[PDB]
RNA sequence: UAAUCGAUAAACCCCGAUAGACCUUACCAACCCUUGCCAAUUCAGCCUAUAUACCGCCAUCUUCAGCAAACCCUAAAAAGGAACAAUAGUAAGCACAAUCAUAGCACAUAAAAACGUUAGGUCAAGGUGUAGCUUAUGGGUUGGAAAGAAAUGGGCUACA
């Protein structure tokens, strides 16, 4: 059950016991991309708006 | 999440096959015999056809656990030929070594 | 604040007993091991790495808790649990005539959280037909009843039961099979006369 | 260790003919069910209660499908 | 690293005492053949390379020969050939040349006095003496060595040995000599055995191409072979296989003088024939003199056949046959 | 060129460990396996479960002890109890080290339904075998 | 999904493409901006998103003589802590984005005449603290190799001098610019000339020298004519200790000659 | 048990091995905090551990659920919640909102839950158990008497006992386990009536056809300790009566007697024999910790020997601990630390130095680290027998063991050197130890002036004046000046070494601060000047002194 | 010198049930390396000789399982990587064993079993005859 | 044809695939769902493009031996560094070799083969920088993914 492992690891990372370098790198890259100006479009406005 | 949507579908197929294992076995017991009259065998075929598609054990695919690779996997370790090599070359698998003879 | 404590080597006594420091299996901590051992492939101008920080010494299973002195000390305490084997069965010739029945039972151990092994249910029964009260007709009927399970060169009947889930159930079923095979070999029915 | 199979013995597994009383003795139902009983007896992966479920399911199915067994030309109960 | 080795020596002594105490043997009688045995038991590392296994020896074997100090506190070098790069090899060469000159002048004086008391002490063929190898010389001299200088040293040693040897020169030149092992290839002859009032009974073993054959030979019976309970004629329909059986007996002219019983397993017809031929040849050594057993071994009867099928390689067909290589 | 489990040689200044300095073809010749269990024998079973547990342990411990781990872990499986041996740099105080080991000894036990032992060896720095 | 993750070392090695095959022969140099950021710089192992204060990681183990139970920060405290963490990110980015201007010995984009610092001390322990050195010429030298092809190696001319009349020059060639600088500095001190300076400000007499293909005409000047010479001869004379000189270079203007 | 090995609970790595008792306690506390934090996550997220892989299905590692199964049914919603404080209080209100009838068994658990955990809320709950339902007194007193005792309200127990005896219901053995305490704890100028009430209750206990267990005889001795120190006759009579019925007295039973004997032994030492001859009979059998109040038994039975300075009895009381269970008799680490320190306090000066050192290496680094008190006794053990070879060995361990107490034990650790003689073979031990103590205080911590007088004589017989002279300059610049005895002693060493250049610098700084023996120093320097032929400088310093 | 006293507190009872008898006890220990098996065999024989069991030791032939995988990732079948798994067996034979002696031997054997090896135990239980075959006539 | 993709000179062509009736399958046509696997996240998810941004894995030179840090020298130095009766060369290290495995040696095989060349293959084992989708380039169900005018590579069967 990959869901159990993923949820447990994420919960531990948020609580402050596990440090996930891959997720931290993903968050850093997402932060830099959003600061640059190309972020995640909101649902319901990508095509129409 | 899981590795892939294909793996997420395959685990559901395995769960459905586990749920419908006994019923399919009982129905096939009525089809794989010659003692019973052929009249009820057609009704049994209709009943087994009325079963959900993902209930038969023929839809399961032995993918890799780590990378969900549909082919190139070993049944003993449930791992693809590449993940197996990656783990074995680091010495993380006991008794596994390069063959030299 | 950083602190560096010297290991037990400077404090280990020369005549101090070894099993006291290694009573059970241990990960071979170099601080409690006074023996300077170098393990690893040496360099051309170098020497094999010392015990400190050596992963090679940690990889292998250590037998420091199974030194001969510790083995003797442990077995001295274990002598109280065992019973004395009767001398009346020193040779197998008397064992055959006293206990003709042989029960082969398989046991397996493997590292892991699970214990069930499908080969544990197998129980084998071996009975020498030369130690039974079979008559000529009973023996001739039993040989054909069992078929290939009984050999002629050694004259030992073998029962291979694996139907029962439990090992005790398999043993009881083997005993029942032996009982019925012995009993029904004496019954002569109407179809035997033809 | 830790598994007792509900305290059953070899006679709760090998012998299952006592559950075939509610079936025709001379019809093809006996011929069909003796094979499934033999299979269950040699099956070590199922429990005695689990085999009861299979045989009861067969009893229920045969007793539910009454028109087909009558139309087959062979009398069955 | 002078103090480091000294500390390691004390640590090794303490560890040896502790190992003896924990193993239960007397530390006074504890030696290396017990140290390695106890190490192999306490740390059973299963590795194919012997040098990778745990080892606890004296530091002088583990650490290499460390170069001694060359100069004092004032900086003046000790040896007078320090600035020559190789103060050990060049000092040895200088001493050898000085001894050669001393031998030459002493021999000239002896010839002037018309006296001959020296003998030829250079022929060491029966002893089996050889010259030092480059590694052996690098063991004696801590500094590294080359090939040309080693050749020069050997050619000077032979020049020195070619002259009338002195009293102190022979012992100096002998320390550069090494003994060679016995090069005798003579095999061991099994003694004749007498089992169950049976005279002239011998046994031999042979292997060829995954075929193991054990042959017992009786020297008092007639000439016949019993293989696997059946006669050789029935067991080997092919004449070449029976010629394999005839090959050893015909070489010794013992066709009708020995009775042989063989048990051979594995391999095919030819492999079994070769295995039984080898076993019979090895077994017949006891019934023959030492002159003809050497003739058999020179004819190829007492030697094994290492020709074994090679393992198939990946990407190939028969370990040699490559796939059809298309140029374009 | 073979590149599996092989650290490329730099100009001659990078520090490497004994395990890293040996190519994978030297396994069982010059270096041993990082994990030992009975699942990889001939007539045994349950090998995939052991492998997935081992890889989960690797990934969990890497995040549990970030930046202070010296080399790969040693996972010994011996009669239903699992021993985990690690080499850790002495960067964290023992007060935090004991907290982490006490946390792990119970978390892994309750997650894998088996007793676990955790052993740590503190090193001043990563041990260098080849050129540094 | 958890088993699909890798380590930060491999993630950065793949993202930066430092060992890429296109940057080997010279196809790169288009975007020369390589920066690797350590994500474990200011992350406390006890801190988390939910704000739990563990007794062994975040808060001290014993407070007021008793044991501390598992506690959680308030929303305002968590906002304050995350605001401080965010402020640290921009504080580090401020230092990272700032680049100190390089030395302009002769021009803003050259290494001629720039200061390189005192040379490294010798093996015996002699330290050259009064010695100052300057770079006269930096040139990228290429060589044709059988396998790689062009082999770029930097050759640097470096001149040392103490200002008391002792000075020298050397050439250091190496694959890396810093290695060439170090080799030139460590080799210049071995070749030192002594220059006789009249009154320690000028030369004794005018000299007209004809080198391989370079003609140098230097004339003695009084105290008021300070170093009206070539842009490299002025640096060399400043290192030597000459304060007044007029020099004209005719013919080839090769730096080494 | 191993001698040079740390306890198994701590990690064997030296960087994780605790150094002091506080560090040992802190490491275990931190590890237990991590274990509790992990269990908190396990309980808060059960779904991440519901999958079971072990075949035997061990229940100890399964997550625990804090939520009650049934919420709508009032009857079924109370049993789940009582076993798991504040939430249990609302269960009674929720059940009573629907006017649900509560039986005599459901309310007993609710009352016990309040009694175990938890002033006016207690009365508000007590009125609800009595006025609402006619509950059985057996379920009444077990809560009321055990709850009102901790609330300093013992008057209700006596009132409830009258109703209990009137209801024709016998009182269990547990009722008198608290009634005697409730009666005894209140003392208003009288003790005989309070003690007679206990006697009347004990007499009624046998009439009620209920055998009093060991707890009644343990609690009467608990009550007889705080009030009267001369009430040993009833305690001994009850101890004798305990042996008559046939039940062995527990460890706490002897502990209570020993506490009062320790109280009464200060004025008269004749009671110590009764302390000594009672443990001999109890040491001959193997005991088991069947009473939770047995932790103080050894704490009180060894403190008497420690105070009375007995070692043959300390050996026996330690053998009693080591006979049955070496660890299941001490609960907290504070008691173990206070035990071992005063246990080793007697093994130093009484027995020989060899056995003292033999016991030193298996108790100090192995079991637990001493306090500042044992360090003084260890120093007192050395100077009496003139043991100087082991001084550095004790000192190097003291750096890690009593580092916190170093500032208060350093003035005493160095004083022993002034009483013994310094052999010529003991120069390095006096040099390295003196260097290691001077290298730390001047780099950062009051520095006593007595250590300078010791280091002056340490180098006096060693012939090392160069290193001895430089240390005096470090102290004379610290704005503190020692007595002139050290100056006079070092003048002899300077005269022996023929260094007139030292005393001239010494006196010119010593006489400037008005030392009481400056006249003696000025007389002593003239003696060395004549033999050193320094008459030219003899008057040179006289002129400076005059000016 | 601080040796605790009365440290031996066993609980051994002799039940009236007859003890189980065993004819032959075969212990087949399988592992990856040979040094571990040799050390384990030495330990086992040293333990057995003290108890007086007359253990017999022989080495069954090893088994090597080899397989082949692709060397590259996407497309390279001409080049392969072959992996090998060695399994070495050690056989310990015990004869004339009792139910309690076998139990106490297996206690000291299995508790100290190395992590890298497994063990198969085969017992030859001894019985005289079942009750229904002593002297029955149908 | 509505019906994948990549490889496609040595180094592709029974190659990814040690493997396709549904699933596999990323292809197409018909139909449904859009904070849509996870505790949460103006978030998930993309087999979308870029192998000319990569890591991980390999191919070829390749059973060729060279690569290379620190130095030193040249009547300047782009670069080179050798004469054994020796003329400026010392050189850690990686390669080669040795060792290891095919349960005894020797041989053979196996294994190994550095630095780099081919911007060689692989975004489709897996993650990924950059650029693009969010009631769709995302997620599910059913049914179809032919056929050979023709050419060619590799194998089996034979032509006795
Ligand atoms: Mg994916
Ligand atoms: Mg072929
Ligand atoms: Mg500019
Ligand atoms: Mg120009
Ligand atoms: Mg295609
Ligand atoms: Mg294409
Ligand atoms: Mg190509
Ligand atoms: Mg479909
Ligand atoms: Mg399809
Ligand atoms: Mg898609
Ligand atoms: Mg490319
Ligand atoms: Mg070469
Ligand atoms: Mg050059
Ligand atoms: Mg080199
Ligand atoms: Mg070999
Ligand atoms: Mg070879
Ligand atoms: Mg090859
Ligand atoms: Mg090689
Ligand atoms: Mg390309
Ligand atoms: Mg391509
Ligand atoms: Mg991708
Ligand atoms: Mg693509
Ligand atoms: Mg074709
Ligand atoms: Mg092909």
Automatic annotation (TrEMBL), chain A:
It is found in: Mitochondrion. The gene is MRPS33. Keywords: Mitochondrion, Ribonucleoprotein, Ribosomal protein. Residues 33-49 are annotated as: Disordered. Residues 42-49 have a biased composition (Basic and acidic residues). This is Small ribosomal subunit protein mS33. Belongs to the mitochondrion-specific ribosomal protein mS33 family. The chain holds residues 96 to 144 of 148 of the full protein. GO terms for cellular component: mitochondrion; ribonucleoprotein complex; ribosome. It comes from Sus scrofa.
From TrEMBL, chain B:
This is 28S ribosomal protein S14, mitochondrial. One of its GO terms (cellular component) is ribonucleoprotein complex. GO terms for molecular function: structural constituent of ribosome. One of its GO terms (biological process) is translation. Belongs to the universal ribosomal protein uS14 family. The gene is MRPS14. Keywords: Ribonucleoprotein, Ribosomal protein. It comes from Sus scrofa (Pig).
From TrEMBL, chain G:
GO terms for molecular function: RNA binding; structural constituent of ribosome. The keyword Transport does not apply. One of its GO terms (cellular component) is mitochondrial inner membrane. GO terms for biological process: translation. Residues 24-38 have a biased composition (Basic residues). Keywords: Mitochondrion, Ribonucleoprotein, Ribosomal protein. It is found in: Mitochondrion. Residues 19-41 are annotated as: Disordered. It comes from the Eukaryota. Residues 131-195 form the S5 DRBM domain. Belongs to the universal ribosomal protein uS5 family. This is Small ribosomal subunit protein uS5m. It comes from Sus scrofa (Pig). The lineage of its organism: Eukaryota, Metazoa, Chordata, Craniata, Vertebrata. The gene is MRPS5. The chain holds residues 88 to 344 of 430 of the full protein.
UniProtKB/TrEMBL annotation, chain H:
One of its GO terms (cellular component) is ribonucleoprotein complex. Pfam families: PPR_3, Rib_mS39_PPR. One of its GO terms (biological process) is mitochondrial translation. Keywords: Acetylation, Mitochondrion, Repeat, Ribonucleoprotein, Ribosomal protein, RNA-binding, rRNA-binding, Transit peptide, Translation regulation. It is found in: Mitochondrion. Its main location: mitochondrion. One of its GO terms (molecular function) is rRNA binding. It comes from the Eukaryota. Belongs to the mitochondrion-specific ribosomal protein mS39 family. Mitochondrial RNA-binding protein that has a role in mitochondrial translation. This is Small ribosomal subunit protein mS39. It comes from Sus scrofa.
